[PDB]
């Protein structure tokens, strides 16, 4: 029912940039608050950004300030990640995930797509 | 003893830029939440931007995503507001604010500064 599908991972060379998206389907995108999250290799889940249902507040993990931008289509339910300046620390698994708006709690998750910074 | 003064307002042609400045003093101010408040000329007040105390994330009034951009400098003590693409629309009297954190709510004040959009 519920549908997220990432793409735009894959490999940079350290400065370069890229841009992640994460289509949804199944559900009133415009609703809920959606989140990226990454894993570094043999490391645990960790926040990256999140962005309200609107549109119109967002967080920003203090490791990507001034590099990293997310932002939403509520019209063709995406959720995107704008990634500049990017450097070998930000080699991950990349998740969106969606949140409930009771708890904001996330109740479900894209398939992850893999993002190596290598010269 | 807490203080803020806020400075940067005034005249701008329609489409032009300007930067509000909200110099803070007396408090410890990465702990508090900030937030830019306006008065259009015989308005009710109307929350304009808001940004956390480690500046991670940040609030728009929908009426100006896109186009201003609040951020603030934990050294300086200072609290800013970029405001880009103005229009008539946008004159008023802006006031920056403070948040208690036990509540969010506003517990002190700017001065206030009038932007006037017109040719």
């Known amino acids: 029912e519920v549908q997220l599908v990432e793409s735009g991972g894959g490999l940079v060379q350290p400065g370069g940039s890229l841009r992640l998206s994460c289509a949804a389907s199944?559900?009133?995108?415009?609703?809920?608050?959606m989140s990226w999250v990454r894993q570094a290799p043999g490391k645990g889940l960790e926040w990256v950004s999140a962005?309200?249902?609107?549109?119109?507040?967002?967080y920003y993990a203090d490791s990507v300030k001034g590099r990293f931008t997310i932002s939403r289509d509520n019209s063709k339910n995406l959720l995107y990640l704008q990634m500049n300046s990017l450097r070998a620390e930000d080699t991950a698994v990349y998740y969106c995930?969606?949140?409930?708006?009771?708890?904001?709690?996330?109740?479900?998750w894209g398939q992850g797509t893999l993002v190596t910074v290598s010269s | 003893e807490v203080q803020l003064v806020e400075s940067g307002g005034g005249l701008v042609q329609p489409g032009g830029s300007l930067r509000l400045s909200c110099?803070?003093?007396?408090?410890?101010?990465?702990?508090?939440?900030?937030?830019?408040v306006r008065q259009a000329p015989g308005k009710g007040l109307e929350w304009?931007?808001?940004?956390?105390?480690?500046?991670?994330?940040?609030?728009?009034?929908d009426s100006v995503k896109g186009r201003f951009t609040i951020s603030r400098d934990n050294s300086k003590n200072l609290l800013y507001l970029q405001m880009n693409s103005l229009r008539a629309e946008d004159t008023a009297v802006?006031?920056?604010?403070?948040?208690?954190?036990?509540?969010?709510?506003?517990?002190?004040?700017?001065?206030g500064t009038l932007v006037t959009v017109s040719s």
């Open positions: 995930a969606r949140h409930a708006p009771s708890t904001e709690a996330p109740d479900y």
């Open positions: 199944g559900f009133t995108f415009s609703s809920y608050a």
């Open positions: 962005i309200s249902g609107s549109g119109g507040s967002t």
